[PDB]
Structure formats: structure tokens, C-alpha cells
């Protein structure tokens, strides 16, 4: 270990090394050419090979941070392409690195990546598969500077493993795309999740974050002892803090250590880690973070024993509140892998509130005795919402479900952009699709995972373009009662119907050719606009109107000559509805 580069190069391998060096140099230097970055990776790769041969060879001793920042500072243009950033090069050892991290422009101003055509992609991917994948890795990398390099490399393998399995099929497009979409979705969810966690950290402090991590890791490792859990919650919190900070090398080291640790005390944490701990250094932490819940001892007492019945609760509580409450989450969480973390945190905050009222009364034990009773309501609240919503999603398909939501929310916050109201109705509908397929045991957790990112995106958007104070209240409210805040939104009885506009409800024959996913966008955009014009409409007046419009295009799409029955039968419907809705 005389050489850091040689060790990582040897641990990682030439292939993964060249890839990670690329992703790393593309996250900083996100305005440089591909050919330019490729010249670096080759320089740095030949260098690391030198150190592998002779660990005492010039510079091989230097640390990765020094070697890395040293290479950056050699970029000829740097100053004219980046300016301010080039001033970092005047600083020393630790400041220099911190300087670069500061100028790491999150969300750059690069053109959307337009997905080529299945036939061109598949041809590019054969005529030179390496520079094809590397050229795209580079593309995605520069667009997501805070995306964890190793994980960004994990997707770039499923992408490669898709072009492999599809560009050889009869119907390549039928193969490729649906996976290229599952991936796009996945990578987008992953990125949103990471940004989400780094915000909760900053916005709500580590206390809140720790409370989250406890509940989460307790469900995951129900066999582990609270002391172990605490140990992990601590390491875990220090890892996130610095990965959030953006330092890849620092963050990478911290994650490797923690994985190495967890893998060591494997039998002390959980039985479902065998597989993950067999994998290489690169995919170990990632594997573990995704691991499945272990089975709970089954020989677990009652929470009421140590937390509601027994006396000295106030005694054990006052001694170290946070640790006592942390003991409650851990106890409750590992017994309920079927609950959502926020639901668990909601029970802990409630417990915390009672304890803070009873422990100060004449007869404490008599005050908090009925506590577990106050939990019932909080538990059934998300439970009922999930049942009623999945049952409905089963009657009407996804699309007709997405429509149901559309009407519901547009009526709550009519002030919202239609295109955005549609986007959210489609995303929420997917959540019902992905999640309702699960048994009642894994539903609430699923819902939380998905709704969380959606509700956040919703909020970051609203941040930029404020629309309703009510949405702001929920968005700025506590991260634990954020969703319930949205669930409590009410029909906007103050909204003033948007004046009619023929053009808005004017349909053409093109609606006949538009893809299913386009035919829907328009039927849906019209549905929103319709609810925005007559908000007091009923689920029956709307059902009727939607029905007329249904057969409307059927007897106009299948009709000899469209552009006519579309403008003829059209006025009829607009005029007919205008009245049947008055």
C-alpha cells in the first residue's frame, strides 16, 4: 500500500477503473469534449499501470485527491472554458479540492439527450461498442455530477446488457425500448432519491435523519441488537453527510469501509447478506443497501411491557431521552416491516409527546397507560387510503385510474398548470400500478418509496413557480406529515372557473393516428381543461360527457373522411355538453 492508485487499480480492474475515471472527470469538467476526456483516462490509466509495476515510481506515492486535482489543473483551456474554477489551481492540497467541489455546477445547461432510433443505436453499438457506451456514459455523467460514480456504472451495464439482448432479436425495437424506458425511469428515481435524502439531511438536521435511519435499518435487520443498530446509524449518517458533500473519493472510501464492516459482523447483523458480501469491492455496498428484510426472531415480547406498562419509563426516558426514543423505534420497526418509515416516526413522535406530558404529572403511569391506543388512528389512516385506492385501481385500469386522479386533484388545486397536473396524474397512476401488485404486507412501504420522490419533485417545482399557499404549507411542513398534508387538501371552493375557449376543446383527425401515449396525453389535457372550466361538475356529468366524447372519435376515426365529422360532430358535442352541464 505504498501506492493508492496501484491498489485501487488492482482492486477495481482496468475495465472498471477506466470507466470510473471517465465518469469522475466528466462530473467536474462537464463542458469539455469527449475526445478530450478520453485522452485523460488514457493518461491516468497508463500512469496507474506504472505504479502497479513499481509502487516506488515517481508520484505513485501521492494521494488520489492530489493526483486527481493535479490532472484537472493541467487542462490547457480550463480558465477560458471554466474561468473561476481555474483559480482553484492556485490553492494547496486540501483547499484546492474543496474549491473544485464548490464550482461543481449541479444541473448544467446541456441539451436534452434525444434518444436516437433503435436501428441507428444498434448499428453504432456494433461498429464500435466501446466508444458507443463510453460516449453515452460521458453524456449522462456530465448531466448528473452528484450521481454516485459506482452506481452510475451499475446502470451503464444494464444498458450494455440490453443492447446485447435486443440488437439480435427479430423485433429489436420491441425488445430494446421497454427496457430503455424501465432504465430511464429507474435512473431518474435513483437520482431523485439521492437528492431527496441529501435535502432532508440539510433541511431537517441529523436528529431527524438519525430517527429515519433507525426505523429503516431496524426493519431491515430485525435480529441485530440495538447497540449494533446505533453503531450503524452513526456510520451511515457520516457517510451520507460526506457523499452529499459531493466528494467522490471521500464518499467511496467511507462506503467501502462500512460495507467491509457490515460484512465482517455478518452473523451479528443479518442472514440475508451472504450474497452481497461475496460480490467484489465495487458492488458490495450497493448490494447491501438494496438487501431484503431479514425475518424477525418471532420470539419478541410486547412493546407494552417495556414502554407502556413497566414503571421507570420516565426514569429511563429522562436519563437519555433520544436513546430511549431510539430504542422505541428500533423495537417497533423490527416488529413492523409492513409499516412505512414515516408511519413509524409518526408513532415515535406521538410517544415522545405523551412521555413529555405524563412524566411531569402526579401519576405518570396512569397518564400514558392508554398510549398504544392513540396509535390505532395513525396506522389505519395510510392503510385505508391504500386499500380504497388499490381497489379502485383494480376496477378501472391504469389509464382510467390516472383519469380519476386527474379529476380529483385538478379540483383541489385548479391553479396548477395543466401539463403538470397531467404529469402528476400519470406518475401517481404508475405508483398504483407498481405497488398494488403487492400483498397488503408490502404495500405501505412501496407507496412511501414512490410517493416520496413524487411529492418532492412536486415541491421543488412549486418552489420555482409558487401557485398555492396550501401546497407551500405541505411542502414546507414537516417531512413526516408532508403526505398527510396533501391528503388533507380540499376542493377549492374559492376557485373561479376558467372562461370557455372553443379552441381548447377543438379536436382534429390527427387524434386518430397519435400513439396510445399521445392519444392519452390529449384526452387527458382536455379532461383537465374541462374540470377547470366547470369545477362544480359531477362525477356523473363528467362521466356522461366523457362517454359522448368517447364514441365521438370512434364514429369519426372509423368514419369515411375525418376532418369533417370531426368539426361537424364536434360542435354538436361541445354544444350538447355546454348544456348538459349548463
Ligand X SMILES: CCCCCCCCCCCCCCCCCC(=O)O
Residue of 352, 344, 379, 325 whose CA lies nearest to 219: 344
Q: Looking only at residues 271 through 290 of this chain, which bind ligand X when binding is defined by CB under 6 A?
A: 281-282, 284-285, 288-289
Among 38, 57, 64, 359, binds ligand X (CB under 6 A): 64
The verdict on whether residue 250 carries a ligand-binding annotation is: yes
DSSP string covering 13-55: -HHHHHHHHHHHHHHSSTTS-HHHHHHHHHHHHHHHHHHHH-T
Q: Is 206 left (phi over 0), alpha (psi -120 to 50) or beta?
A: alpha
Interface mask toward ligand X for 159-198; x: CB under 6 A: x--------------------x---x--------------
Among 211, 269, 404, 531, binds ligand X (CB under 6 A): 211
Residues 298-306: contacts with CB under 8 Å, at least 24 apart: 300/334, 300/335, 303/328, 303/331, 303/332, 303/335, 303/372, 304/372, 306/331
- Alpha-helical segments (H) within 465-560: 469-476, 482-487, 516-533, 541-557
The verdict on whether residue 1 carries a ligand-binding annotation is: yes
> Is 442 a binder of ligand X (CB under 6 A)?
no
Please state, as a whole number, how many other Cβ atoms lie within 10 Å of the Cβ of residue 85.
21
| Cα distances (angstroms) measured from residue 478 to each of 240, 481, 485 | 20, 6, 9
| Cα distances (angstroms) measured from residue 258 to each of 6, 196, 253, 261, 286 | 22, 22, 9, 5, 11
Q: Looking only at residues 127 through 156 of this chain, which bind ligand X when binding is defined by CB under 6 A?
A: 133, 136-137, 140, 150, 155-156
Interface mask toward ligand X for 288-307; x: CB under 6 A: xx------------------
Q: Looking only at residues 247 through 266 of this chain, which bind ligand X when binding is defined by CB under 6 A?
A: 249, 252, 255-256, 258-259
Nearer to ligand X, 85 or 236 (CB): 236
The verdict on whether residue 11 carries a ligand-binding annotation is: yes
Q: How far apart are CA 173 and CA 385, in angstroms?
A: 39
Residue 475 contacts residue 463 (beta carbons within 8 Å) = yes
Among 208, 379, 509, 557, binds ligand X (CB under 6 A): 208
Residue 277 contacts residue 284 (beta carbons within 8 Å) = yes
> Is 72 a binder of ligand X (CB under 6 A)?
no
Q: Looking only at residues 511 through 530 of this chain, which bind ligand X when binding is defined by CB under 6 A?
A: 523, 526-527, 530
> Is 320 a binder of ligand X (CB under 6 A)?
no
Among 172, 216, 223, 279, binds ligand X (CB under 6 A): 216
Q: Looking only at residues 369 through 388 of this chain, which bind ligand X when binding is defined by CB under 6 A?
A: 382, 385-386
Q: Report how far Cα 17 is from the mean position of its chain's Cα atoms.
A: 27
> Is 313 a binder of ligand X (CB under 6 A)?
no
Nearer to ligand X, 1 or 80 (CB): 1
Please give the size of the binding site for ligand X, defined by CB under 6 A: 109
> Is 222 a binder of ligand X (CB under 6 A)?
no
Binding residues for Zn(2+): 65, 245, 247
Binding residues: 1, 4, 11, 65, 238, 242, 245, 247, 250, 253, 257
Amino acid at each position: 500500500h505504498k501506492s493508492e492508485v496501484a491498489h485501487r487499480f488492482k482492486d477495481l480492474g482496468e475495465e472498471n477503473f477506466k470507466a470510473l475515471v471517465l465518469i469522475a472527470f466528466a462530473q467536474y469538467l462537464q463542458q469539455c469534449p469527449f475526445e478530450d476526456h478520453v485522452k485523460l483516462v488514457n493518461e491516468v490509466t497508463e500512469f496507474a499501470k506504472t505504479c502497479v509495476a513499481d509502487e516506488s515510481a515517481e508520484n505513485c506515492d501521492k494521494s488520489l485527491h492530489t493526483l486527481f486535482g493535479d490532472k484537472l489543473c493541467t487542462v490547457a483551456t480550463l480558465r477560458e472554458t471554466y474561468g473561476e474554477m481555474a483559480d482553484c489551481c492556485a490553492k494547496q492540497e486540501p483547499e484546492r479540492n474543496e474549491c473544485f467541489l464548490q464550482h461543481k455546477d449541479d444541473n448544467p445547461n446541456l441539451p436534452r439527450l434525444v434518444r436516437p432510433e433503435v436501428d441507428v443505436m444498434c448499428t453504432a453499438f456494433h461498429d464500435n461498442e466501446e466508444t458507443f457506451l463510453k460516449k453515452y456514459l460521458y453524456e449522462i455523467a456530465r448531466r448528473h455530477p452528484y450521481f454516485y460514480a459506482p452506481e452510475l456504472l451499475f446502470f451503464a451495464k444494464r444498458y450494455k446488457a440490453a443492447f446485447t439482448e435486443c440488437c439480435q432479436a427479430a423485433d429489436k425495437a420491441a425488445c430494446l425500448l421497454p427496457k430503455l424506458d424501465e432504465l430511464r425511469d429507474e435512473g431518474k428515481a435513483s437520482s431523485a432519491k439521492q437528492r431527496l435524502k441529501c435535502a432532508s439531511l440539510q433541511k431537517f438536521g441529523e436528529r431527524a435523519f438519525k430517527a429515519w435511519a433507525v426505523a429503516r435499518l431496524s426493519q431491515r435487520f430485525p435480529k441485530a441488537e440495538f447497540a449494533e443498530v446505533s453503531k450503524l446509524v452513526t456510520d451511515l449518517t457520516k457517510v451520507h453527510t460526506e457523499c452529499c458533500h459531493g466528494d467522490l473519493l471521500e464518499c467511496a472510501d467511507d462506503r467501502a469501509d462500512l460495507a467491509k464492516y457490515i460484512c465482517e459482523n455478518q452473523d451479528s447483523i443479518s442472514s440475508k447478506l451472504k450474497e452481497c458480501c461475496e460480490k467484489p469491492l465495487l458492488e458490495k455496498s450497493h448490494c447491501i443497501a438494496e438487501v431484503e428484510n431479514d425475518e424477525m426472531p418471532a420470539d419478541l415480547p410486547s412493546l407494552a411491557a417495556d414502554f407502556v406498562e413497566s414503571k421507570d419509563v420516565c426514569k429511563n426516558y429522562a436519563e437519555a431521552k433520544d436513546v430511549f426514543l431510539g430504542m422505541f423505534l428500533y423495537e417497533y420497526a423490527r416488529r413492523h416491516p409492513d409499516y412505512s418509515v414515516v408511519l413509524l416516526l409518526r408513532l415515535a413522535k406521538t410517544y415522545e409527546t405523551t412521555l413529555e406530558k405524563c412524566c411531569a404529572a402526579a401519576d405518570p403511569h396512569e397518564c400514558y397507560a392508554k398510549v398504544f391506543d392513540e396509535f390505532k388512528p395513525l396506522v389505519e389512516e395510510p392503510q385505508n387510503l391504500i386499500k380504497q385506492n388499490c381497489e379502485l385501481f383494480e376496477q378501472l385500469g391504469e389509464y382510467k385510474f390516472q383519469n380519476a386522479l386527474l379529476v380529483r386533484y385538478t379540483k383541489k388545486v385548479p391553479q396548477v398548470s395543466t401539463p403538470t397536473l397531467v404529469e402528476v396524474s400519470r406518475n401517481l397512476g404508475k405508483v398504483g400500478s407498481k405497488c398494488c401488485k403487492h400483498p397488503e404486507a408490502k404495500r405501505m412501504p412501496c407507496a412511501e418509496d414512490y410517493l416520496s420522490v413524487v411529492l418532492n419533485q412536486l415541491c421543488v417545482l412549486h418552489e420555482k413557480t409558487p401557485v398555492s399557499d396550501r401546497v407551500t404549507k405541505c411542502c414546507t411542513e414537516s417531512l413526516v406529515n408532508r403526505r398527510p398534508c396533501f391528503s388533507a387538501l380540499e376542493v377549492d371552493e374559492t376557485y373561479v372557473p376558467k372562461e370557455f375557449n372553443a379552441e381548447t376543446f377543438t379536436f382534429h383527425a390527427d387524434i386518430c393516428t397519435l400513439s396510445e401515449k399521445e392519444r392519452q396525453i390529449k384526452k387527458q389535457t382536455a379532461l383537465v381543461e374541462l374540470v377547470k372550466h366547470k369545477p362544480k361538475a359531477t362525477k356523473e356529468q363528467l362521466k356522461a360527457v366523457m362517454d359522448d366524447f368517447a364514441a365521438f372519435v370512434e364514429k369519426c376515426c372509423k368514419a369515411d373522411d375525418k376532418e369533417t365529422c370531426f368539426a361537424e360532430e364536434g360542435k354538436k358535442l361541445v354544444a350538447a355538453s355546454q348544456a348538459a352541464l349548463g
